Amino acid sequence: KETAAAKFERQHMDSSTSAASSSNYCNQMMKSRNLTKDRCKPVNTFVHESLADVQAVCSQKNVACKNGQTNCYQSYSTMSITDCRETGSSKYPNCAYKTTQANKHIIVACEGNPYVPVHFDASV
Numbered sequence: 854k855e856t857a858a859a860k861f862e863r864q865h866m867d868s869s870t871s872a873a874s875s876s877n878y879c880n881q882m883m884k885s886r887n888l889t890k891d892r893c894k895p896v897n898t899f900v901h902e903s904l905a906d907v908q909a910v911c912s913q914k915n916v917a918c919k920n921g922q923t924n925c926y927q928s929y930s931t932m933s934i935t936d937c938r939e940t941g942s943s944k945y946p947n948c949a950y951k952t953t954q955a956n957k958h959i960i961v962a963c964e965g966n967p968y969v970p971v972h973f974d975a976s977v
Contacts, residue, residue, distance in 0.1 A: 857964065857971035864888065865973050866907065867899040872933050872954050879937035879950035893939050893948035898973055900959060901933040907970060911963035918974050924962050925974050931956040934976055 855863070863886055873879075879897075888894040900907055910928045918925035936953040943949040955976065962972035 858969045873935040879952040889948040895939045897937045899935045928958045
């Protein structure tokens with residue numbers, strides 16, 4: 854059983870590149886992070902910052918989550934991110950994604966001791 858913290862890292866962290874370089878980034882990454890194993894995950898954001906920077910957001914700007922809870926945090930600064938969204942003609946198992954590189958604020962939900970990101974809520 855993956856902890857929620859570990860699942861967040863697998864789904865959302867990519868501290869190995871500064872930005873997506875190509876339009877096939879999402880196809881590549883959704884596969885290898887095994888986000889297309891049983892179904893195509895429809896929407897997923899990758900963050901190109903250090904783990905430490907992303908974890909730090911749990912100490913930044915407290916905001917409501919989409920779901921009404923109040924354990925969400927917005928990053929003070931923008932971060933390099935890539936937005937992956939399944940195309941309309943994507944069919945499992947040949948999952949296909951639009952890649953959008955951006956510099957936006959992230960919003961995450963934080964939980965636990967240590968108090969660390971467990972959900973990606975949105976980018977701004």
